[PDB]
Amino acid sequence: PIVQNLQGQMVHQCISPRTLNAWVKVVEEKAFSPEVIPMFSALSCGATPQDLNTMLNTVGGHQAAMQMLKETINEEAAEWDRLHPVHREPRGSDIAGTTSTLQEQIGWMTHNPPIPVGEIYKRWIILGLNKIVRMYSPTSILDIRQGPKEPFRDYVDRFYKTLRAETETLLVQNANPDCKTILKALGPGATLEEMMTACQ
Amino acid sequence: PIVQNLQGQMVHQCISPRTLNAWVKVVEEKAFSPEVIPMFSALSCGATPQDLNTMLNTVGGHQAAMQMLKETINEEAAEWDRLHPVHMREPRGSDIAGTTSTLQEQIGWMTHNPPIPVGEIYKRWIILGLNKIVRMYSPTSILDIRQGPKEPFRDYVDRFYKTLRAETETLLVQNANPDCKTILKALGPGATLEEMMTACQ
Amino acid sequence: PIVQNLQGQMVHQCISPRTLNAWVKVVEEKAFSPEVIPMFSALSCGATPQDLNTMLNTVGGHQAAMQMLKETINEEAAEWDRLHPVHMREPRGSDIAGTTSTLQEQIGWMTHNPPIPVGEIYKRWIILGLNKIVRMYSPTSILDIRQGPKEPFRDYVDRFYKTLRAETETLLVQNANPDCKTILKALGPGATLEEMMTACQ
Amino acid sequence: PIVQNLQGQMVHQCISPRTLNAWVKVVEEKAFSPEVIPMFSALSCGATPQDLNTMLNTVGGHQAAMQMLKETINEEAAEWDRLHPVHMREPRGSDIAGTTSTLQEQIGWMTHNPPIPVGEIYKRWIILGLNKIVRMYSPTSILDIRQGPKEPFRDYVDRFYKTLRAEQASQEATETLLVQNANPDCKTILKALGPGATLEEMMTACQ
Amino acid sequence: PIVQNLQGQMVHQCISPRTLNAWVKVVEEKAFSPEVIPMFSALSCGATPQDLNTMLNTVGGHQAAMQMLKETINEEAAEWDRLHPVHMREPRGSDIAGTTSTLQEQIGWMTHNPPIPVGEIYKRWIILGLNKIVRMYSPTSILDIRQGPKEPFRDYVDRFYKTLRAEETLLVQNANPDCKTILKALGPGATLEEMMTACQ
Amino acid sequence: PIVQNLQGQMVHQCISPRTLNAWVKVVEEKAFSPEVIPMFSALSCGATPQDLNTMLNTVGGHQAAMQMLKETINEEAAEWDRLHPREPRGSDIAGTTSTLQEQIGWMTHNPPIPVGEIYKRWIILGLNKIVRMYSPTSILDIRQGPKEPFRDYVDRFYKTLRAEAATETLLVQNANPDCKTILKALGPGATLEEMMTACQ
Numbered sequence A: 001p002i003v004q005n006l007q008g009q010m011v012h013q014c015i016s017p018r019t020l021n022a023w024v025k026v027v028e029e030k031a032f033s034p035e036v037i038p039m040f041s042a043l044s045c046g047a048t049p050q051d052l053n054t055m056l057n058t059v060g061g062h063q064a065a066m067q068m069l070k071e072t073i074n075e076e077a078a079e080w081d082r083l084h085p086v087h088r089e090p091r092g093s094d095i096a097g098t099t100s101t102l103q104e105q106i107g108w109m110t111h112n113p114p115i116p117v118g119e120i121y122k123r124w125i126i127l128g129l130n131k132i133v134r135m136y137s138p139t140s141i142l143d144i145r146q147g148p149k150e151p152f153r154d155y156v157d158r159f160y161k162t163l164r165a166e167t168e169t170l171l172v173q174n175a176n177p178d179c180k181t182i183l184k185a186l187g188p189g190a191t192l193e194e195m196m197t198a199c200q
Numbered sequence B, C: 001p002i003v004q005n006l007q008g009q010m011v012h013q014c015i016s017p018r019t020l021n022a023w024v025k026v027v028e029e030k031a032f033s034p035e036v037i038p039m040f041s042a043l044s045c046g047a048t049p050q051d052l053n054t055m056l057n058t059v060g061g062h063q064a065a066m067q068m069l070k071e072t073i074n075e076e077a078a079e080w081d082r083l084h085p086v087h088m089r090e091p092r093g094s095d096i097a098g099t100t101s102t103l104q105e106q107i108g109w110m111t112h113n114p115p116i117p118v119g120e121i122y123k124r125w126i127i128l129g130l131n132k133i134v135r136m137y138s139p140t141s142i143l144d145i146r147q148g149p150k151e152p153f154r155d156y157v158d159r160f161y162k163t164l165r166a167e168t169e170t171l172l173v174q175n176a177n178p179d180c181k182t183i184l185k186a187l188g189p190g191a192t193l194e195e196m197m198t199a200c201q
Numbered sequence D: 001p002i003v004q005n006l007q008g009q010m011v012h013q014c015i016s017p018r019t020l021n022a023w024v025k026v027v028e029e030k031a032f033s034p035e036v037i038p039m040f041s042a043l044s045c046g047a048t049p050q051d052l053n054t055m056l057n058t059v060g061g062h063q064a065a066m067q068m069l070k071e072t073i074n075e076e077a078a079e080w081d082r083l084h085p086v087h088m089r090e091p092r093g094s095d096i097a098g099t100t101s102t103l104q105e106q107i108g109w110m111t112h113n114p115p116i117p118v119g120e121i122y123k124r125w126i127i128l129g130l131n132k133i134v135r136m137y138s139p140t141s142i143l144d145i146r147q148g149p150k151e152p153f154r155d156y157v158d159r160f161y162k163t164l165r166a167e168q169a170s171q172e173a174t175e176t177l178l179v180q181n182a183n184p185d186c187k188t189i190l191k192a193l194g195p196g197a198t199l200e201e202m203m204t205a206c207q
Numbered sequence E: 001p002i003v004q005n006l007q008g009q010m011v012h013q014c015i016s017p018r019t020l021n022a023w024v025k026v027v028e029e030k031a032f033s034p035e036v037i038p039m040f041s042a043l044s045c046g047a048t049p050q051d052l053n054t055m056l057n058t059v060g061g062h063q064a065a066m067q068m069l070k071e072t073i074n075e076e077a078a079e080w081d082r083l084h085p086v087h088m089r090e091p092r093g094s095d096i097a098g099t100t101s102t103l104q105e106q107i108g109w110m111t112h113n114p115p116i117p118v119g120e121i122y123k124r125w126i127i128l129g130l131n132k133i134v135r136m137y138s139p140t141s142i143l144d145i146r147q148g149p150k151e152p153f154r155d156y157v158d159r160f161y162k163t164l165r166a167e168e169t170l171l172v173q174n175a176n177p178d179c180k181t182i183l184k185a186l187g188p189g190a191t192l193e194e195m196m197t198a199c200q
Numbered sequence F: 001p002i003v004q005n006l007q008g009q010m011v012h013q014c015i016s017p018r019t020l021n022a023w024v025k026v027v028e029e030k031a032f033s034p035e036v037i038p039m040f041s042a043l044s045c046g047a048t049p050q051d052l053n054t055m056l057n058t059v060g061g062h063q064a065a066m067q068m069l070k071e072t073i074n075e076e077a078a079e080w081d082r083l084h085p086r087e088p089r090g091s092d093i094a095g096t097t098s099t100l101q102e103q104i105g106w107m108t109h110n111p112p113i114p115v116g117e118i119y120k121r122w123i124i125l126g127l128n129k130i131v132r133m134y135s136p137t138s139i140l141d142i143r144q145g146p147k148e149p150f151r152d153y154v155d156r157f158y159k160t161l162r163a164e165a166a167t168e169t170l171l172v173q174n175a176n177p178d179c180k181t182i183l184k185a186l187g188p189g190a191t192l193e194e195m196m197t198a199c200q
Ligand SMILES: Cc1[nH]c2ccccc2c1CC(=O)N[C@@H](Cc1ccccc1)C(=O)N(C)c1ccccc1
Pocket: A160, A163, A164, B053, B056, B057, B063, B066, B067, B069, B070, B073, B074, B097, B098, B099
């Protein structure tokens, strides 16, 4: 990421081994489950475009997903080039880090006024990662139906987990006959707290 | 969370990997046992509303509970909007929860003079919601905690006050077993838990 | 705990994830064995009353013991109120325990000149209470620690002074077995534990 | 790596135990899989030539690979000597690799003004050599990655671009080949999307 | 241990959780094996007498050993009182051990000019006591370390010098008949390197 | 190791718990495999002679090896005394007869007398002797198996070479009949890359 030294000039702080390993391990364990994205964002805090690429390059498997991410980056970079025509001023390929030095990236971010190439590129990466989360989502919301002997609590967990990866009235629909009858009896506009308390 | 840099202006300190992982692991291991809340508060110390959302978003399972938490946030945000009507701008409820406010704005309000502590306010709402989650996921009721025939008093008191925390001193005596109960009544009114435990040992 | 920033004002340093987890894990593994207390004190170094409560609240089980600790806190707080009658304000007992005082107030009193160390005072009460817990949960009495027939002296001395710490030098000799006891009396009065152990080896 | 002390002069910051162990463990677990290189680069950030050698020397096995790396270093060092003929002294190839230069000299060149970044140059050679190792230890060729009859497209694309990365060694016709080596059922659906289709669209189609 | 703050005055740095735990765990795993002492010294680097007591108090078992250590501290404290008779005050033996001195006083003496290093002195006494504990808890005597019939010399030498550390020509004596004959043939003044190479 | 404080004078930085534990664990896991030495050097970076002794003393087993190391230290210290007849003698460099403040003295002195780097040189020299003895197989006995890959043989070759010009030609000699014939066909001066590629 980014620091000001004792000499006054702003220079690249080396990305830490804890952070490097943290990001590698989350992707190993959680793949591209929704919670990986908030974590990516947090671990890549204050990151230069170089650092962002470092973090993505440390991911070992999942090359289909990472290739999809490349395409989303290439798309968002072209969209930037369209809205910001060269008349230095950072183009899309400079923001993604393909055609810009580290000192330039430090330049734009630490410049006054700040051109936050790191936060912009992260926005594109996250945008791409979300697309990956949505595709790799295994089950559809429609197929989450409460089992006969399944607790409501466990069904609601499965419902809103599936919902996050990919509505309040559907939760009632896909409940089992016994809970469904109790849920309809509470009437319209009932809170999840009340619904869960009822089927306990 | 929040720091003043060498340049003088107050800026966002990146939430640390230790802290991120600490919060993830407690929720993995302890789920929503009462002791998770104090820990959440402590790990989310000095947190901006963005950081609070980061921490909640890093939680993977428990989406029923997190959805209940959303509703409590939406309720407390509407209650704020009601008491603080809109006329550096004045923060509405959706700005405090972080849905409609930038990081620089959140830094703004908290580091502003006078301080409008949006982080501490939002944390209050989150904890309020988390408490509701602790209370629901509490399995047993206080009335059903009764001392077993061959159960030690020590173990019963543990089970009593554990159940009490998740969800009075005279009830502890009531639900004791016949042998200890007789010894406890003999100590008389106003006896300390120390004395009661010492007696049934 | 507590730090002075670059701006000059003293502000709350967020309690670290290492420290939080350290305290949780010691209590998980060691329960309330005597060595937990020195560790609690050390981990809670420079702690505000808020931080002390954070640390106690992160403990999950043992609610009987923690309830005893509450009573000791309530007693010591009432004793403070008695000796310091209310006439930056002057801190009452409930302000020291952190129930009726803000973080900024606690920072206030501790960093004030002259320093009113509410953190060190409250820690004194907590430790006082924790000691009572250590003393009760102590299973065996010193009088019942007697050396076995085929037990090594080394192992007996371990059991003796372990029991002594949780709850004299001449008693150690008394409760030794007939064979070692005869060798120990032969060393004569004023013998060091080193010499005594060397003798029965 | 490298730091300025309180006395003003620039001095060697001792390479950290986290970093040392991080590099040892990645090589133990991942051997010379493509992702090891980005990590080597990142862990060896701001490293002097001495530190780079420290890191390579902490690797225990793989001595065939490390011997190949030595040869690549010896080649790139000779190429440097050729382009920079000897006429604080001017650093030759053996000084950049750290065989014939002190730590204080290496600090010298890197912290000098203008900066002669011997550390970044030597890292370039090491990575160049490591890439050759990744490329050789790459088991399968891109042409032999063909989608199975009951294999998901997702899994095939993973296998495709994994193999592509190792052979090109994390460095950038191939998009059209992905369609070719797909199975008859997906291939027919993929051709129907027409030219210039994104991988997102292709994957969505064969799902 | 000990630090100078931004205000200029020297103040107590809180003993770190890594250090606390490090010391606890070594004593759990290694008990009072000889290598524990160097580690105690290293972990207790720059420690005030308070901190030294903190570290000893965090040890849970081994109360026989810790009681022996107390006696060694009480002895060395009395020896100090004898040589330094009371006439910022002058530190007596009970002040060095931390029983009758405040933290601010201990900071006082150590950071004073000239430095009265109460921490380093007390550590010397603790280590002196710990060594006595190592020596007693040493299970085997040097005389009973004899090389087995099918035991390698390497393994015997390990067992020899391990036992020696806890408590030269004898090393040759207690070797087995086959190696002993080869060792005597090398003649007097032979290095361990040469001896080990011979019986390989 | 060694630092300058806020007061200006150079003082002993306490050796870290990470570093202490790192060195203990490598020796536990890797014993005295060649890669332990580079790691020892790296972990003992900027170390005073005291710190070097601390690190060696934290090693628990292997007392035969550590005793060999003592002898190498005693030899190199006597060699120093011979060539250099306050001014640091050999026993002062090894840390047996010199205080920490003296060691800080010589290293931070101007001109710098780097007693730490000198003593490390002796330790490493001794450690190398230990690596060389504990090396199980000789280079001559590393011969390629009938169904063994060349890759695996080269690994075994250069591993054995590290523990213990003409050597490059021997690699070809001890290869199996099928690869050996392919290797000779490449002709003199062939790179290991080319040789490995050929027998694949
Ligand atoms: C965690 C989660 N589950 C979902 C299910 C369906 C759709 C989206 C989601 C999300 C992401 C999700 O919405 N996360 C929340 C943060 C959050 C997480 C957990 C509990 C409370 C607040 C968020 O990012 N923001 C901005 C937010 C904050 C307050 C109210 C509403 C939204």
